[PDB]
Amino acid sequence: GSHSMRYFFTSVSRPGRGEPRFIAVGYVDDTQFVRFDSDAASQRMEPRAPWIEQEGPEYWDGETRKVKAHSQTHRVDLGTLRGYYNQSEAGSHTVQRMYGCDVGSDWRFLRGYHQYAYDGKDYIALKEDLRSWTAADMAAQTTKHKWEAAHVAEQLRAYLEGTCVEWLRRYLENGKETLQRTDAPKTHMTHHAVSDHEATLRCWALSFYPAEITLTWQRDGEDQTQDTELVETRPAGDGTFQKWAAVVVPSGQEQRYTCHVQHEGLPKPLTLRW
Amino acid sequence: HMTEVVRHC
């Protein structure tokens, strides 16, 4: 199936306390494999998955250098953005960055992305074709000109199209037991009477990887959108995920409703009935 | 593998 490599960076200013919190984590699809925490004692990019441990010193010294370069850039950016918006030194603010590349079943480059947000809102983003920025505000317009002057998009694009995919290919090989597995959902249904006249049907999917899944409720072969509640897909803690969808139904009508499960390790979707 | 391409906004 398709795969991705994504890095995520979070920078949180703490007025009156000194340096902002900086956290970085790196993912291959839904498996984290590296991390850095401004508050941990090592000040090194740390491994989080067995297969990245094979990389030797130059890889680690490099990623630590790079992650620190991100840390420092964010640290300045918090100050710069406060000025861009004439905000005071009083409140805590957040910068977030996310970039990465996607590849198809052939492991060939599909797409790249690089976006940046301040205070939880889109600030600036590389366009789909990796050649220009989308900057909605005036502040982002200012940034856009600076990044143009320093050939940021040209150099990012080279990274995202080459280095990003080459190392994803490498990771997928080095951790093929971990990363290339497809664990199919284990499914079941529970039932709890709400009132005299209603009952909850809950559709359960457990221990699946990857996290991408679809759970849909169905009355009489038609797609339910009314009374239907879907929780956030949630990590079990062992590299698998869980999700449920519930639907409130009139008592004695249960057999009108089907749950439909779609996932990569199911050749056909599952139709569950109560 | 992270990028080196980051610049002050």
């Epitope: 100050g79 710069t80 000025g83 | -």
Partner: T-cell receptor, first 114, second 110 residues
Framework: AGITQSPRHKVTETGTPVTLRCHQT?????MYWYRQDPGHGLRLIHY???????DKGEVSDGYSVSRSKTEDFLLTLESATSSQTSVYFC?????????????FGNGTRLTVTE | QTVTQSQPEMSVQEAETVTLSCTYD???????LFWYKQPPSRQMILVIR?????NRFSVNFQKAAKSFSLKISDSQLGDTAMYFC??????????????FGKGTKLSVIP
Amino acid sequence: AGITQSPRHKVTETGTPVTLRCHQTENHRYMYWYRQDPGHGLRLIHYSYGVKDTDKGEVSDGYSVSRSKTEDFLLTLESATSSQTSVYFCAISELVTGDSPLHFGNGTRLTVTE
Amino acid sequence: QTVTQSQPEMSVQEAETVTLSCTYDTSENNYYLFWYKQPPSRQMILVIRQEAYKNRFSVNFQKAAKSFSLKISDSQLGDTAMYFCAFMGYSGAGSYQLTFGKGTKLSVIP
């Protein structure tokens, strides 16, 4: 370019405090204080990435800086030492790249007499 | 990150050509290099600029070799100066600043 350092020449008694003032008209974000000494080139004392944002260069110690406003970067020596007899250079940059280089002021000859 | 000017002093006969050496160290793909001329006025005058990504004074930019020599042909007496090589990072060590070499005092001889 439009830097002016104040003062251009100074003599100061060992243990006195003295301040050097670098002033720009350009409204540029990045300012620097370097000192030039025989056998060391120019070495960075402190820098500032923006208002009230300063950090240490490689020859930090003995020197403080302040970035109250954008236009001024002040170099301060709490207690003058003879080792701080040097030529002091301020620098300004808009983006710090090849096409937006550091522009230097004309320097300040300071000697710390006993 | 560091810059190396291995020759503190050099001489040239007037109208002849001279080459000042400069090497640098960096772990980064992108960066910028500079030559500054400092005449007896003490001003720092930018003479050459170079971006790593991509007239009597010329540079031989050898990126693989990390070498950035400055050639002055047809030396005038006005070229008597101290010449500085400077390094500027992109994102990595020494980004947003210049790191200088130790300088070469060039004396042009009539």
